[PDB]
Design a protein around this ligand. Structure first.
Ligand SMILES: COc1cccc(C(=O)N2CCCC2)c1
Lengths: 300, 237
């Protein structure tokens, strides 16, 4: 059971931890979050009560170091930091709990949502997408562009997602133009799985990371990358029978977690009608088809 | 993006561009079989590739053979079309490759774009214009060369004949689209108008009769009169 303590809450703010969130009033005596399940990656995120452009957060695993949040009044935002002094850390944490200034990671014990949305997301793969190797944690906000979004500006503040492009030499074997474009099995199996990701778990980890960045930050690029990784699988005649089975699971929990009211900005009508009804995998995402048709029938 | 009524005179500048019409690539006849079911019989096709500036027509003849053993022919026709365009671009010197290829049917965007990945600086554009290039097979010499052929085969013409000697591309193109619209609306009529006077003939390397300026004004008006007749006769106006 790990802790992210806060120096204070100077400014009014809605704090988020994984799929949960609470309002902290300006100079309400709040001093952090305890009881964060060890063993998964987490994300703490902020939207201030003043402007809603400021939607920012940090991906972290407390198995990597001792993290705390301190408001910096110059950059004007809640900043994550690492305490290298174990002793000073465990000392301030125990003080704040005894005082009871910490909210509890509110986990219902039957609930496997977070595990199901993060099953293949590993911090190390995160630190290769939000390059800033002088922190164990990784910063993300609404604005950050993708490397693919820079090509179609600032390369230090990019999301370095794997580049998927259905109209590229990488996706199309010369002489197979038709075959490879209608059936992306090559681009998925040889080029991407075997070529770049190595295994289905790293692919799923990106797909999963992309979605959460989309849903927690309304990050347009992450959403483009989520839809693309889905479409690639749905647009392949030849997919490992285990991958189809796992994806249907991953997408079920993603559609389940999605706030009802953001359906219209986070869901690509075209990719979903293709996946569930046109593509090779129309008959292969049973749990995904059921929760889509019952929760978002309007989009099909 | 899309070629429309606004960006029309760009056809005639000094940027090399080709139109591609794929409507006559895949052609069939429909018949009743012995058991009383329906079947198709593929016939010779052609890709229509035109430089509207010069009038240079790259007519790729498509032999029935190409369809043998293949499924989703109508879909295949579009990929075959894109392969044949790609090959024609690759065979041309760099200074003759086109900067734009305008396709007449949006369904050719994806095939052509995929096949031209080696030509990043060649824009594939659709058009909003309702261009009558499908009537290309109602030109006697084009039909004849297509239907006589016994193998794949590229044939070259200037669809403006020698008009550019006397008029501009803009005018040449208008004469062309007017002639093709007539042909499309009422082939029998349009052809009667074009060949009535047997003393005006078709040069051997030409597709249209060797009309005088005065005689082209006659013809153009008769084609227009013919297009209007068949319109009001079909919407009872
Ligand atoms: C590329 O097509 C061309 C080039 C130069 C000239 C012509 C032309 O007017 N011809 C070629 C054979 C009959 C009429 C076509």
């Amino acid at each position: 059971m790990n802790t992210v303590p806060f120096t204070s809450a100077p400014i009014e703010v809605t704090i988020g931890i994984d799929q949960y969130s609470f309002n902290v009033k300006e100079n309400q005596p709040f001093h952090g979050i305890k009881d964060i399940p060890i063993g998964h990656v987490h994300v703490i995120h902020f939207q201030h009560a003043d402007n809603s452009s400021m939607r920012y957060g940090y991906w972290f695993d407390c198995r990597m170091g001792n993290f705390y949040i301190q408001y910096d009044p110059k950059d004007g935002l809640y900043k994550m930091m690492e305490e290298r002094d174990g002793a000073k850390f465990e000392n301030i944490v125990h003080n704040f709990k005894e005082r009871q200034m910490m909210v509890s990671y509110p986990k219902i014990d039957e609930d496997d949502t977070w595990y199901n949305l993060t099953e293949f997301v590993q911090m190390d793969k995160i630190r290769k997408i939000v390059r800033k190797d002088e922190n164990q944690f990784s910063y993300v906000d609404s604005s950050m562009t993708t490397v693919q979004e820079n090509e179609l500006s600032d390369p230090a503040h990019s999301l370095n997602y794997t580049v998927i492009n259905f109209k590229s030499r990488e996706a199309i074997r010369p002489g197979h133009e038709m075959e490879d474009f209608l059936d992306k099995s090559y681009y998925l199996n040889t080029v991407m799985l075997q070529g770049i990701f190595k295994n289905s778990s790293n692919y799923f980890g990106e797909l999963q990371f992309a979605f959460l960045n989309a849903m927690f930050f309304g990050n347009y690029g992450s959403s483009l990358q989520w839809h693309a990784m889905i479409e690639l699988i749905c647009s392949s005649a030849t997919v490992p029978k285990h991958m189809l089975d796992k994806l249907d699971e991953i997408l079920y929990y993603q559609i389940k977690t999605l706030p009802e009211q953001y359906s219209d900005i986070l869901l690509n009508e075209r990719v979903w009608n293709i996946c569930l009804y046109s593509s090779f995998q129309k008959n292969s995402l049973h749990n995904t088809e059921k929760i889509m048709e019952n929760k978002y029938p309007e989009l099909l | 993006g899309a070629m429309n009524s606004s960006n029309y005179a760009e056809l005639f500048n000094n940027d090399i561009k080709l139109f591609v019409d794929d409507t006559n690539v895949y052609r069939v006849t429909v018949h009743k079989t012995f058991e009383g079911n329906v079947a198709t019989k593929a016939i010779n096709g052609c890709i229509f590739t035109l430089n509207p500036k010069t009038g240079h027509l790259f007519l790729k003849i498509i032999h029935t053979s190409v369809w043998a053993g293949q499924k989703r022919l109508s879909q295949l026709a579009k990929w075959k079309t894109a392969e044949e365009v790609s090959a024609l671009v690759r065979s041309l010197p760099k200074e003759e490759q086109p900067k734009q290829i305008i396709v007449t049917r949006k369904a050719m965007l994806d095939p052509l774009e995929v096949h031209m990945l080696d030509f990043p600086n060649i824009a594939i554009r659709p058009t909003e214009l309702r261009l009558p290039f499908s009537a290309a097979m109602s030109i006697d010499k084009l039909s004849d060369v297509v239907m006589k052929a016994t193998e794949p085969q590229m044939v070259l013409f200037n669809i403006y004949d020698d008009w550019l000697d006397r008029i501009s591309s803009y005018t040449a193109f208008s004469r062309l689209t007017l002639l093709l619209r007539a042909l499309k609306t009422n082939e029998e009529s349009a052809k009667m108008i074009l060949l009535s006077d047997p003393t005006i003939t078709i040069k051997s390397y030409h597709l249209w009769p060797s009309f005088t300026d005065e005689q082209w004004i006659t013809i153009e008006s008769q084609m227009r009169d013919l297009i209007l007749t068949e319109y009001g006769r079909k919407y009872n106006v």
